[PDB]
Symmetry: D2
């Protein structure tokens, strides 16, 4: 249960990291 | 140049706002 | 233990949120 | 104006890099 939630949190964090990398490229 | 620059500034601001919202959601879940 | 780690993760997330708010102001 | 703009761009890039590093650390810990 906890492990499940963490998996969804970690996917979101990875997606945010990819978005911030794209933002840095724009900059 | 400047209107494109100002638009890009507003666009990145909106992206960062969305990211902040997501991090607030994660905080609540933790 | 888990609760402890989450507290330190949540403080970091709150700090990041404050930093991103300052970045948005600069923008 | 433009050199200040370019510097600010590089400064924000560096901040976002640091934030990415922190989120990677959180991911590892979760």
């Amino acid at each position: 249960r906890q492990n499940l939630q963490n998996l969804y949190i970690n996917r979101c964090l990875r997606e945010i990291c990819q978005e911030l990398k794209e933002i840095r490229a724009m900059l």
